[PDB]
Amino acid sequence: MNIFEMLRIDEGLRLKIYKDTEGYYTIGIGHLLTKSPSLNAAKSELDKAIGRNTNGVITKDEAEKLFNQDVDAAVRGILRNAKLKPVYDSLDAVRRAALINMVFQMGETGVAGFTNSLRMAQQKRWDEAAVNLAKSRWYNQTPNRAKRVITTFRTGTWDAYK
Ligand SMILES: [Cl-]
Ligand SMILES: [Cl-]
Ligand SMILES: [Kr]
User: Fold this and answer.
1) Catalytic residues per the record?
2) Strands of 14-19's sheet in order across
């Protein structure tokens, strides 16, 4: 397993504009298009992202391209973030994937505020980190996904994904 398969599981894949768990316009593998309630606006951002008149539908290859860009951007965001990088650099490969998933989902800003969890993680206090991570709106809103990611972080294995 790896980061890509990991997020492809958690995000699914949809070729038509759809609304996410928060009701925002999204497409592909979790590619948020806009927080605006306007489909038009969303269709406009879609066309801008793709480079063509999509009419709100993309192909699989197009969805995967956006996905590669987003995973890439997530990693770079982590490395460019002074609160995140040191955490990231201290982790093994599996746990790094867990932190990338959270950033992909919540944004760098969002993740950098799990201050307390980040410190336990950096200290390698897995179980404690795990309990602290569950005390969050993130977990109450998307509990099944949150649990898979938290288990990953805690154990450093891919068991939650098998
Ligand atoms: Cl884009
Ligand atoms: Cl979920
Ligand atoms: Kr974290």
Assistant:
1) 11 (proton donor/acceptor), 20 (proton donor/acceptor)
2) 14-19, 25-28, 31-34
For ion ligand 1, residues whose CB falls within 5 Å: 49
Q: Which two tokens stand for residue 108?
A: 């760098």
Distance 107 CA to ligand 3 centre (A): 12
**CATH number, domain 1-162, options 1.10.530.40, 1.10.10.10, 1.10.630.10, 3.30.70.330:** 1.10.530.40
Method of determination? X-ray
The distance in angstroms from the start CA to the end CA of the chain is 9
Q: How far is CA 47 from the centre of its chain?
A: 22
Query: Domain segments of the chain: what residues?
Result: 1-162
Compute, in angstroms, the gap from residue 64 CA to the centroid of ligand 1: 12
